[PDB]
A paper describes a structure:
The injectisome is a specialized bacterial organelle that utilizes a type III secretion system (T3SS) to translocate effector proteins from the bacterial cytosol directly into a eukaryotic host. Composed of >20 different proteins, the injectisome forms a syringe shaped nanomachine that spans both bacterial membranes and that of the infected host. The major structural unit of the injectisome is the basal body, composed of three highly oligomerized concentric rings spanning the bacterial inner membrane (IM) (PrgH and PrgK in the [name] serovar Typhimurium [name]-1 T3SS)3–6 and outer membrane (OM)7 ([name], a member of the secretin family of OM pores also found in the type II secretion system, type IV pili system, as well as the phage assembly system). To address this and further elucidate the structural basis for injectisome assembly and function, including that of the central needle component, we have conducted here a cryo-EM analysis of the assembled native needle complex resulting in 3D reconstructions of the IM and OM rings at resolutions permitting atomic model building (3.6 Å and 3.9 Å, respectively) and the 3D reconstruction of an isolated helical needle filament at 3.3 Å resolution.
Although the more peripheral N-terminal N0 and N1 domains were of lower local resolution, the map was of sufficient quality to reveal secondary structure elements for the N1 domain in particular allowing us to position 15 copies of our prior InvG34–173 crystal structure for that domain (PDB 4G085) further expanding the defined model of the injectisome. The final secretin model spanning all domains (residues 34–557, N3 domain loop 228–251 disordered) was refined with density restrained symmetry refinement in Rosetta and notably reveals the dramatic conformational changes involved in secretin gate opening during needle assembly, a fundamental and functionally critical aspect of this giant gated pore family. Overlay of the needle complex and prior closed basal body reconstructions illustrates that the primary sites of conformational change upon needle assembly are in the conserved core secretin region: the N3 ring domain—the tightly oligomerized foundation upon which the secretin assembles7—and the inner β-barrel and membrane associating lip of the central secretin domain, all of which have reoriented to accommodate the presence of the needle filament. The N-terminal N0 and N1 domains, outer β-barrel and C-terminal surface exposed S domain conversely show very little structural difference between assembly states; as with the static IM ring components they appear to provide a highly stable scaffold or shell to buttress the inner conformational changes required for needle passage.
Numbering used by the authors:
A (entry chain O): 512 to 557
B (entry chain N): 308 to 557
C (entry chain O): 359 to 409
D (entry chain M): 410 to 511
E (entry chain M): 308 to 358
Amino acid sequence: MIEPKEIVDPLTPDASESVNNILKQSGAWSGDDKLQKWVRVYLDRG
Amino acid sequence: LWIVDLNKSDLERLGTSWSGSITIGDKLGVSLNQSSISTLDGSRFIAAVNALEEKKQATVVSRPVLLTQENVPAIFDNNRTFYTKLIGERNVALEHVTYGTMIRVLPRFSADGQIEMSLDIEDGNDKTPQSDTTTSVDALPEVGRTLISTIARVPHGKSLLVGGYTRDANTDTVQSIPFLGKLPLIGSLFRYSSKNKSNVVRVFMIEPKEIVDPLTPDASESVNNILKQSGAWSGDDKLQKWVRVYLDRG
Amino acid sequence: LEEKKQATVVSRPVLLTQENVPAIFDNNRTFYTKLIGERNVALEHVTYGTM
Amino acid sequence: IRVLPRFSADGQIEMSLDIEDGNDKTPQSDTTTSVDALPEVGRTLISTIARVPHGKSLLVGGYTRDANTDTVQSIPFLGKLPLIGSLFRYSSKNKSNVVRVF
Amino acid sequence: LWIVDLNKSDLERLGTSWSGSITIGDKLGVSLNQSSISTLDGSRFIAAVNA
């Protein structure tokens, strides 16, 4: 089968809230660590 | 960009399957299910039951980051090899999967503030027939190869999808004996049922952002918080400081 | 011997472009399944390609 | 690493970067701690011009990864009775999470 | 330039997995999990635990 659709809008909600609902529920969240947060924090908010 | 994978599968196997032969007085030989009498004369008929089931679930989320100027190309690619510990040190073996990634882009600015880019991306492992033992494939999940070739524009600081793949599947079979598999008392001792079900999504996202500022705090304070807490700091040594000090402050 | 077999599989790719520009998507996963036995060891596998 | 730098007017530096780092893919270190001794880092390659103000530090590219794995292998009938039903399980979790940035 | 790496992993493995076969009076043979009787007649069923 086939079906296209037109798209003009960004994703709602945002992608940074999608994966942070994945990683805190699949059991792989990695922001608690006080050894690795010193270099992820350069990398999440700019 | 955001790679993301979700895998989920369960499988069950239960039932018997019979074979073998009998004999009567060296005058007649009755065999069940292709058991040749030319290899067996008194070996009576046997059975085989299978019982095993499991539930598998695995996720993997990876992301590359890279910056350019506008109207200039750039390439990023990467491939690590992930090992896992097969059980045994003298009875020795390993198994390993390479995990490759590639991305090249060509961005520009618009008038109203949105970014337009030009994407070829790749991700996956190479097809390797390996990990022969049952949990050896279970250790490291597999993700297939993929390739996009797409220009796509997106408003400032927000996230748009660029392509994906989903898949759902079942399987059902009931293998049995024709006459004796329907009587109510022990008729379900002659079944052989094996369901199977897996369902997998995988999608590539994208989001750019504009950047004008240097990193806050500085990088020399980042690694000096790493090395004094991971336990590898090397400024205490009175034999090696005489040449690192030419090298930290100019 | 007799049996009854039934199987379904439903898959979908998604992708976007602009208008009047080409684009390619292709994919191939390999699906393993657990043959019964760990020391009596064997596997079997099927690649599933899409373009 | 190869580069090609120049000065700007206001004091910032603009450079031209191709860098590489890693080991070559070697199937080796067969014993269990032999891989554990020396860690592995994958190959990487950048091709990027990037400018940065004087004396401060800017990021040029990186890679992170998170993963799980869960499986519960058991016997269908006898794996649910309360008394010794958990003697027929086979559970094996797995979890790794790795960052790396230039 | 500054290379930096952080790696972290943990892994656990626990449980059993069974196999083997029995016999009754040289008249019938019941086997669990692909144990062929064509290699074994009196070798009773075994287990394997990993921890």
